[PDB]
Every structure is written in structure tokens, then in C-alpha cells.
Design a protein around this ligand. Structure first.
Ligand code: 8X7
Length: 259
């Protein structure tokens, strides 16, 4: 077993239907990695393409400061394994939970930094003719040393020129994707990112469906309890515009003075 021989498990850091994720030391270099171990996907199943595309996405994207770095992927004993960098801050979902626990919140300066950093990650992914298609807090990872946000969980990644859309989290999904219009997919990542930042800013849990879900897709920004500058508010708002073409690209996004 490569997993057993090459790596020492330190802590279970994730669990789900796929399998489990462990914080591990690689014995050879002594460094810490996040290693996901998943069962074999069933024949002709969505979980199949998902796990397959994760590795391809990592392969194309390779090393970038705002994308979770891939180190290797292999299979043995009827499981798939992928070895990625370990982000010691967990995900943005974990960070938001910690804020809830201590009743703290991300200030505007921190929200701008989150938006700019993940924005730079998207700009890179989009420049390689790919889209992420599952941006949300739980897929944004955090490295502290101060803080670096890195786009992770690349299982929904697809090409803009031959789009294969697996329906993502309904809470973050732009209306035109639901309508099976895949002609503006990078703008779907932009929509999702805005709502990710809105979650980080202290908004109530986003709706999965219903009237509140539609209000957002009509371009109405969810309520944010803390005071934010008008220019920052207006940027988040145009990022969720009903017309994808009115949403800024990632390139246009990161070139906002406000950030
Ligand atoms: C290789 C698997 C995907 N993945 C990464 O690429 C990755 C990179 N860094 C980390 N760091 C990480 C994650 C979680 C936590 N904590 C979570 C909450 N606990 C209370 C304490 C530990 C502390 C540090 N975690 C990472 N991954 C990870 C870890 C858990 C769950 C998931 C899924 C696949 C659900 O997205 N992914």
C-alpha cells in the first residue's frame, strides 16, 4: 500500500459519502498534506465524472497561489486517492462557523481581501479556458502563516468550449445555468463568488429554493447585518445581476479600485 507506506495519518479532517480526508505527513519529505480516499464510482455515474475531472483539473491548473495545489493521485485496493496541499485554516465554511461560535465576523477589509484573492484564482482558472462550477464557502480553503484563500474541490470543473455541467449547490447557482444555458459559465462562478462573500459577511443561510431564492436571482442582494461601504455593496450586487453579460468577468472583477 502506497498510502500506508508513504504517509502517516495525523488527523481525520473530512468525511462524506465519497469517503474521508486525512491530514498526513509524507515520510519521505516530512511535509503535511491533505489526502482524500474515495470508493470506486459506479459505472456511468455522476460521481465517476466528478472524481475523474478533479485530477484533470488539477493537471491543467497545476501550481497557483489561489488554487489548492495537487501533488499526486493514484488508486489501489479499489479506492481512489488524491494528495493535495494541506491548508491549515480549513475552509471558509469552517472559518464562518468559528465566527459564529465566538460571535465574531469578517470586517469589510477582510471581505475585500477574500473577494480579491478568490477573484484572482477565478481569473486564472478562466484564463485556462476552465470554469469551477461549485464555488461556495466549503470549497474555499485557507492557509495561515497572513492569510491565503485557495480555490479547491475541482470535481465540477469543466471546459467553456465543451461544457459538461453537473448541477452544483442550488444555494449558489445562477438562474441561467438552471435553465440549461451554458453559454456564459464563467459568469456563473462570479455569481457564486458574490454569494460566497455575502455568506462570509454575515448573511442569513442562503435559500435552496422558494421565493427568497428567486428574489436573489432577480438581482436582489441578501441582507447583510453589518455596515459595508456603498461601493463594495454595489459590486456584490452587479456580480449577481440577472443578465450574465452585465456581471464582471474575473479579470474585470480584480481590477476594481475598491478592492
Ligand atoms: C484533498 C481533499 C480536498 N481537500 C483539499 O484539497 C484540502 C486542503 N486543505 C484542507 N485543510 C483542512 C480541512 C479541514 C480542516 N478541519 C475541518 C473541521 N475540523 C473541526 C477541524 C479540521 C482543517 C484543514 N482540506 C482539504 N480538503 C478537504 C478536507 C475535508 C473535506 C474536503 C471535501 C472533499 C469535502 O471538500 N476536502
Amino acid at each position: 500500500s502506497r498510502y500506508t507506506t508513504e504517509f502517516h495519518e495525523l488527523e481525520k479532517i473530512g468525511s462524506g459519502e465519497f469517503g474521508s480526508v486525512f491530514k498526513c505527513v509524507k515520510r519521505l519529505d516530512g511535509c503535511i498534506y491533505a489526502i482524500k480516499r474515495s470508493k470506486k464510482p459506479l459505472a456511468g455515474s455522476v460521481d465517476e465524472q466528478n472524481a475523474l475531472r478533479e485530477v484533470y483539473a488539477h493537471a491543467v491548473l497545476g501550481q497557483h497561489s489561489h488554487v489548492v495545489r495537487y501533488f499526486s493521485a493514484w488508486a489501489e485496493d479499489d479506492h481512489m486517492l488524491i494528495q493535495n496541499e494541506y491548508c491549515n485554516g480549513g475552509s471558509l465554511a469552517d472559518a464562518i462557523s468559528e465566527n459564529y461560535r465566538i460571535m465574531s465576523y469578517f470586517k469589510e477589509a477582510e471581505l475585500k481581501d477574500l473577494l480579491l484573492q478568490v477573484g484572482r484564482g477565478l481569473r486564472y482558472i478562466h484564463s485556462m479556458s476552465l470554469v469551477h462550477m461549485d464555488i461556495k464557502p466549503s470549497n474555499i480553503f485557507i492557509s495561515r502563516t497572513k492569510v491565503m484563500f485557495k480555490i479547491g474541490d475541482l470535481g465540477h470543473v469543466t471546459r467553456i468550449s465543451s461544457p459538461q455541467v453537473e448541477e452544483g449547490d442550488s444555494r449558489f447557482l445562477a438562474n441561467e445555468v438552471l435553465q440549461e444555458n451554458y453559454t456564459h459559465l464563467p459568469k456563473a462562478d462570479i455569481f457564486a463568488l458574490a454569494l460566497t462573500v455575502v455568506c462570509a459577511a454575515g448573511a442569513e443561510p442562503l435559500p435552496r429554493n422558494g421565493d427568497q431564492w428567486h428574489e436573489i436571482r432577480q438581482g436582489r442582494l441578501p441582507r447583510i447585518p453589518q455596515v459595508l461601504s456603498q461601493e463594495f455593496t454595489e459590486l456584490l450586487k452587479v456580480m449577481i445581476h440577472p443578465d450574465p453579460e452585465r456581471r464582471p468577468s474575473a479579470m474585470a472583477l480584480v481590477k476594481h479600485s475598491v478592492l
